[PDB]
Design a protein around this ligand. Structure first.
Ligand SMILES: CC(C)CCCCCCC[C@@H](C)CCC[C@@H](C)CCO[C@H](CO)COCC[C@@H](C)CCC[C@H](C)CCC[C@@H](C)CCCC(C)C
Ligand SMILES: CC(C)CCCCCCC[C@@H](C)CCC[C@@H](C)CCO[C@H](CO)COCC[C@@H](C)CCC[C@H](C)CCC[C@@H](C)CCCC(C)C
Ligand SMILES: CC(C)CCCCCCC[C@@H](C)CCC[C@@H](C)CCO[C@H](CO)COCC[C@@H](C)CCC[C@H](C)CCC[C@@H](C)CCCC(C)C
Ligand SMILES: CC(C)CCCCCCC[C@@H](C)CCC[C@@H](C)CCO[C@H](CO)COCC[C@@H](C)CCC[C@H](C)CCC[C@@H](C)CCCC(C)C
Ligand SMILES: CC(C)CCCCCCC[C@@H](C)CCC[C@@H](C)CCO[C@H](CO)COCC[C@@H](C)CCC[C@H](C)CCC[C@@H](C)CCCC(C)C
Ligand SMILES: CC(C)CCCCCCC[C@@H](C)CCC[C@@H](C)CCO[C@H](CO)COCC[C@@H](C)CCC[C@H](C)CCC[C@@H](C)CCCC(C)C
Ligand SMILES: *C/C=C(C)/C=C/C=C(C)/C=C/C1=C(C)CCCC1(C)C
Ligand SMILES: *C/C=C(C)/C=C/C=C(C)/C=C/C1=C(C)CCCC1(C)C
Ligand SMILES: *C/C=C(C)/C=C/C=C(C)/C=C/C1=C(C)CCCC1(C)C
Lengths: 222, 222, 222
């Protein structure tokens, strides 16, 4: 298409699509209730991402926001993706270690604030206030990362959790950086590079993460 | 009002309203926890539909979307209705057969994708892409219908489930057809007829379904 | 700022922010699963309110709606706040008395209708219909208040529930009054006074409520 980031949106679409199909196939014939939870969560995540990547590719998930005296292209569909996929990823982690309901609520609530404030930040027309929202969102992320380390271990699941939590902490922490330097923030990195960066992170955090989880038998019970 | 479909919106409003009141009355004095689940779900469904039918009647739930070089009237409030009511109907089915959490998640997740992509399709300005979204939404529906047959039987509930699943499969499958031929899609059937069609389906799938469920003592325990 | 209600938005922001921090601090070192539920719910409520108060302060959460032949300032962010915070407050009450799932569903569903129809009412351009939505929303509120009295007692929790339910019934019942007389409704009270009123109610219903709950050991188990 006419926007140079189209190739990364097309690639993200294809990779989320393939990942979804792969997880769909791998989860066929799974009878264990706990495994069924993990396959459902883990397959949904790339399915959702697939749809939102497609919406970006086709132009539906893009809006123009005026700030700094110009029209800035903002892919709002990312936030629609993240709104559902990030709590689902936390839920995968949380179920893995049999987190109590209270901790799950805290995680999901904090995550909604993170994404919600991120979206407000992304759509805010007063440039300086965009970063206020960024800071609030980042505080919520830090709370999530804090809980992931200090807020939950059954030896069925201990080592897989530890790996998935580390992947999670590393990949998630990059998102606020990318937003801060990209088109939503300071605008030091052009939109095509920012889209490439989010695409690598997204596929890694969704399909990558899923592969690690759905390859470990921490999800199965004999 | 000035739009010929108003009569079907008025009738849908009245029928959802009456259905809600009826279920509200029938659920008074119900003490059994499991029955309370089914009455709550089943009463909420038409209550929600009532509100969205009203919004359509009054014009709030209607927007104009440009595609094919014209302004097309699109009732977006349908998707707001379906977003909550369709997962609730799946939940009624799922609770009936004591589905595990993983299957519930899969159903609700697939359903959100179905409705979500349907809405994107309904609001997409590039005509040809409207049908891409339709296809994705239909794939999600097919997955739901697949799970309803192959993805879950306690003899308390077996025969009522089978009836409700068949009603569900027949009525739900018509929605993508109606959308495809109506004002959101190919535009072969005028909006008034499409509204009539959705109204018959909606009342059948919500009030009709509810009557069957809430008349069978598959929901009660002595 | 240029809008006279800014002081009440600034004060609400500060008070929700401080309340969140206070509950965050009080919940540190809490190990009991049930207490963890109540701290998570109760801390999230003001955190969410904080974000939406901020959005109003900064102007993001304000839109202009034409009705009565003029442009009316409508703070839509209130509904975004209430959408999440009101069900969470009901959930606190419901968990306290070990409500069954069916009653929880009914409460949360009714609450969504209340807020949803409130928002439709707030954004409706035909003046007279604004009050139709108000009435539907108020009916949903009345149903909630009905369930809070007749729809659920374990002596661990009985007396704290009774206090929190009374605070809830008194404060919540004022919201429809304020909306009816304020800028969203009949317009007899200017927006600055209405904002002041909602701010007093909000802080009382969120931070006030939370203090009562999180000070009673009805949430702890030895
Ligand atoms: C595990 C559960 O832990 C706690 C139990 O003691 C409950 O969570 C208690 C906390 C719960 C979740 C709420 C945490 C917040 C989401 C963290 C950060 C959100 C901010 C972006 C917004 C708040 C602004 C600030 C000024 C308060
Ligand atoms: C645990 C559930 O809490 C879930 C609560 C979270 C979802 C937190 C909600 C707070 C958000 C900051 C709310 C923001 C929503 C709006 C910005 C969206 C409207 C977009 C605009 C273009 C109309
Ligand atoms: C019962 C649970 O079954 C599985 C356990 O093995 C988990 O669901 C595994 C599946 C879960 C739910 C995900 C299914 C999808 C919703 C089905 C179709 C969605 C599509 C419209 C979008 C994906 C596009 C395609 C190219 C992948
Ligand atoms: C199981 C929960 O998953 C729930 C996940 C599902 C809800 C799937 C979400 C994917 C949808 C395709 C997301 C689409 C939302 C937007 C189109 C809505 C914005 C409308 C526009 C006018 C701003
Ligand atoms: C406790 C559960 O109680 C019932 C079990 O018998 C189930 O709730 C049964 C009820 C459930 C919740 C549905 C109640 C409604 C939300 C109450 C009012 C909503 C209205 C604003 C909209 C409906 C319009 C009217 C004409 C029906
Ligand atoms: C229990 C879950 O039910 C949850 C169901 C409830 C959330 C009830 C939904 C009914 C509401 C009346 C739906 C209204 C939503 C729209 C008005 C929002 C769109 C805003 C507009 C500006 C696009
Ligand atoms: C698959 C997608 C994932 C795991 C996305 C994660 C996204 C984040 C952790 C985003 C975080 C943000 C902030 C902490 C600051 C504001 C900007 C956001 C929303 C990008
Ligand atoms: C009470 C309302 C019900 C049960 C509505 C069900 C709606 C559907 C099954 C809609 C399905 C659609 C597709 C599968 C294709 C795209 C268009 C939709 C959203 C109408
Ligand atoms: C912390 C915020 C709380 C507890 C807010 C509660 C809000 C209500 C009970 C609002 C009720 C409304 C009606 C019943 C009528 C229509 C207008 C509303 C949404 C203000």
């Amino acid at each position: 298409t006419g926007r140079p980031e189209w190739i990364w949106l097309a690639l993200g679409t294809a990779l989320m699509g393939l990942g979804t199909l792969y997880f769909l196939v791998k989860g066929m014939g799974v009878s264990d209730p706990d495994a069924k939870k993990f396959y459902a969560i883990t397959t949904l995540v790339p399915a959702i991402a697939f749809t939102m990547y497609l919406s970006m590719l086709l132009g539906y998930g893009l809006t123009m926001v005026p700030f700094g005296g110009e029209q800035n292209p903002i892919y709002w569909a990312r936030y629609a993706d993240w709104l559902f996929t990030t709590p689902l990823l936390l839920l995968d982690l949380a179920l893995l270690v049999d987190a109590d309901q209270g901790t799950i609520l805290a995680l999901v609530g904090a995550d909604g604030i993170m994404i919600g404030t991120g979206l407000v930040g992304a759509l805010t027309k007063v440039y300086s206030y965009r970063f206020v929202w960024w800071a609030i969102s980042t505080a919520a992320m830090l709370y999530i990362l804090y809980v992931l380390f200090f807020g939950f271990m059954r030896p069925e699941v201990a080592s897989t959790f530890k790996v998935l939590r580390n992947v999670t902490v590393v990949l998630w922490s990059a998102y606020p950086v990318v937003w801060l330097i990209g088109s939503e923030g300071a605008g030091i990195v052009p939109l095509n590079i920012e889209t490439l960066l989010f695409m690598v992170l997204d596929v890694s955090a969704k399909v990558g993460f899923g592969l690690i989880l759905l390859r470990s038998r921490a999800i199965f019970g004999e």
